[model samples]
Target: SKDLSRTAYDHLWMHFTRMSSYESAPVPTIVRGEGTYIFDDQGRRYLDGLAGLFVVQAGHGRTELAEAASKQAQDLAFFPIWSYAHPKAVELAERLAHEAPGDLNKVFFTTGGGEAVETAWKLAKQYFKLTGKPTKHKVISRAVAYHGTPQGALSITGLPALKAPFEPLVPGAHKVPNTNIYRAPLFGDDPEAFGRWAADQIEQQILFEGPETVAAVFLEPVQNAGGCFPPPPGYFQRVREICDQYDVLLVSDEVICAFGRLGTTFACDKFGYVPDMITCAKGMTSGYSPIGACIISDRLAEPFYQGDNTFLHGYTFGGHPVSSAVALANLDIFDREGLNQHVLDNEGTFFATLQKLHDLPIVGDVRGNGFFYGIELVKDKATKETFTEEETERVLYGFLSKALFDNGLYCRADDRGDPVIQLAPPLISDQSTFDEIEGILRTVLTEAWTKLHHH
Candidate 1:
């Protein structure tokens, strides 16, 4: 165990981790995952409150997902979808096209979410170029929303902190206000009014940027980076109208929200909007193997099928055989177990259990839909006074992150927007899992409040 920790510390360049944290303390190494829990090297159990970074949908230790990958590897270890057609990739693309909303019938494969976002952007730009509007190359996305890390996707991403280090990204990507009703600039009391104001922000940007020059608006069904900000009622409907009015394509970036995360195959179905394109990853294969896709409407993909007008983009392992097979098997599990229906049936209970945290002084707000949610921590609940930058650095990172983990709960303590503890447990989890989560959160947050107040 010591050797494992030392090797992890010495060799691993952990993704987006604060190195100093590990320098001061041993990196928390998860060895394996069971149904709704994970175990460390010491075999101590921790409830998987974040669904393994919001990836695992059908729970862990499901041999079926792994067995599919194994069988595919044995049959055909690898095959690229570059001009050659593999059966698994073909099958997944066909299934995803049908599962996606509206006439989004064409599927372009990617190995991960960022690539999917990048491909969607590239496709939008070229799609406009091919269809006689060459100048329509700009994009608009919501503030505090995370699209992905690829340069093109990064440019479309709205979080300044994540993008500052990689400045001079692709140009013409703009930002608009997200549907965070909790922090609405206007119409704070009436939610429908707030929804209108938020959706109009996109129209305002499209008009400001010139309708002829704006090609696309990329948004998530539920925004992930700034703590699971679900769109308000009528928000997506209004956004759809504006996009159609401005001749701009709507791209639903559902990398984390798709595949039963939000009680639907595609979250846009739940929100009642049909995007021209959908960028998705994370849960298609339930983390069995990595695969993502940019599902485009037939109207958008029509030009590429014409004479010598190729999309001119693809990844080396975009539609890997093993990942595709695993995705097929994963979807089977969803259908057989009725995973989406499970979320729909139990989401109220999940929300209600998390709401119990509001009794704590530190819990400012609990907001989200389906199994995805965020609990905002604040200085004062009544005023909605947020934690200072220093307080966030000190308290959110210093204490809350470890305290929750030490108390046998594994979740996210994020300060991307404000200080928020995000939760997106596996779809298989029931009321017992929620109760366990509530109990652990209660203990840790109570300790946090007392520590913050007394000291």
Candidate 2:
């Protein structure tokens, strides 16, 4: 444990973190993991909340997966798919195509989610060029969705704060209102109507921007940033109609929603719609290894199948031999354990357990699907009033972050849409984990309310 701690502080430049925060406090060194639990350096156990940032679908410490990775690495070590094919990559791609919903049969590899998103946009642009709609080059997305950080991906991302410093981004990425009906201004009383209004607004944007100028629509099955905003009843269906009407390709960016997060292989399948492409990563390999693929429909892939009609896209470490093998093993685990069915069976229980926090004065709403969920916190529960900027910083980062951790829960307190406590425990977690999550939230959030009321 000491060695692990020393090595981490000395060598690891962690991603998406403020290193200064760890300087004062020891960088949480997790030495090992068991199903649904992570053991930190001090030997305290915290439920593996957020599934290690929405990865780790098969729980933790699955030696079978580790061995599969080692086996592939020992045999192949390293190989690029540059004009040459690898068997593991080919097999996994075919399996993914089969599992992907609708006509998304072609798979393009990427090193991670950001690259997958970047590739999707590039393909959308090229598809338009090849199909004679050369002017179609823009992307539309839900406001506040965290697509990725790569330049092209960042451009398409809907967060203004995240993209401001990086501007002059690959322009043409547009934004619209998210599907958070809890915050819907026009028709909060009727979710279905709000969904229609939201979908129709996209069509309005396409017409405003000139349908000829927009190439694709990028949306998460359940929007992640504004705290797990799952689509309303008719959202995707109406979106599909709009896409077909405008000749815009619908791209379901299921980076987190796919692979049992929503009790299905793909969110589109769960929702009953067929998209032109699906940009996916994260759960594909359960985050055991890095791998991402942009799955495209047969219609989209047709033009590039012939000689010289190259898409001119690929990543060196994309379909890495080891990652492909890991992915295959991960799929095996999913099948053997029936994790997808597990989510389907227990989703109601999970939601019910989270609803316990609703009694707390600060708890506003609980919304999401399957194992993934978000608990919105509010200044006033009756009015559904959200926290102001200063209040969010003071209440969330200043207090709630440390309080929840001190209570042995490593969950995220986010404010991208509004203040919310996000939770996506490993799919393997069950009623016990749900109760623990609820109990911890009850204690910590109740105290949070007390502190806020005093202020």
Candidate 3:
């Protein structure tokens, strides 16, 4: 175990990690996972609160999914969909098309979320060019929202800190206000007007860029980076109208919200607005295998089908037969077990349990839909005063996250927008899971508040 830790510390470059910190502390090493619990190298059990980065929808250690990948590897280890068809890819695509709302019938595969987002942007640009709108190239997204990490996707991302190191990113990516009604500039008492104004900001940005120059608006149904800011009622309905007016394509980036996370196959179906493109990954195969897709509407797919019009973009591992087989099996689990319905039934309980945390002096706001949620931390609950950068560093990042993990709950203590604790456990989770999570959160957060005042 010590050797494993040593090798990881020496050679492994963990994503977005603070490697030097591990010199004093051994890496928080996980050895195995089953159901909604994971065991560490010391054989200690922890609740899978974040669902392994919002990817493990069907829980872990599913023999069926492992067998699906195994059988597919034996049958057709690898095959590119570069002008060739594979049985699993075809079947999975067909299933996704049927599940997706409206006429989002065409699927373009990628290895993961960022690639899918990249594909959507590229498709948006080319679709407009082919259809005689050559000036349409700019894109707009909500501030503090994360799309993905490829240069193109990163450029489209709204967080400046994440992109500053990779400066000189692709041009014409713009920002607009998000639907954070809790921090509304105006209309603090009226959510409907707040929703209207938030949608109007998109229209204003589109006009500012000159509608002819803007190509698409990429948005998550419930923005993840900003502490799970679910759209206010009628938000997406108005957004659909704005996009229609400007002829800008709407891309619903469901990389986190899809596949029962929001009690639906595609989140757009749950939220009730059909976007021109849907980019998704993570739970597609329940993290048994990695796969993502950019599902397109029939209108967008039209130009590519016509004469001499080819969308010259693809991935070598796109629609890999093995990943596709795993996805099919994962979907089978969703259907046979009624995972979506289960989420619909249990989300009230999930939210209510987390809502109990509001009694804590540090708890600010608890908001989300389905199993996805974020509990914002505050210094003064009376005025919704957030923690300062110094306080966030000392408390939220430096203490809260580590404390929760030490207390046997693996969840997110994030500050991409504001200090918040994010939780999106497996769809199979129930009352017992919630109680375990709630108890750990209560104890650790209570301890955190005490530390803050005493310090």
Which candidate has the top score in lDDT? 3
Task: Summing lDDT over every window of 10 consecutive residues in candidate 2, give the lowest-scoring window.
Answer: 1-10
Q: What residue runs in model 1 are displaced by over 4 Å at the alpha carbon?
A: 1-5
**C-alpha local distance difference test of each model:** 0.91, 0.89, 0.93
By lDDT, the candidates rank as: 3, 1, 2
lDDT of 1 by residue, 174-211 (tens): 99988877877789788898989899999999989899
Q: Considering TM-score, where higher is better, how would the candidates rank from best to worst?
A: 3, 1, 2
lDDT of 3 at 178: 82
lDDT of 2: 0.89
Backbone clashes, each candidate: 0, 0, 0
lDDT by residue for model 3 (1-455), tens: 56345767788899989899877567878989999989998899989999999999999899999999899999897988998999999999999999998889999999899999999999999999998999999999999999988999999899999999998999989999988877888886798899888998999999998999999999999999988999888889999999999999999999999999999999988888999999999999998898999999999999999999899999999899999999999999999999999999999999999999999999989999999999999999999999988889889888898899999999999999889899999999999999999999999999999877766
Worst 10 residues of 3 by lDDT: 1-10
Q: List the residue pairs that clash in candidate 3.
A: none
RMSD of each: 1.2, 1.8, 1.1
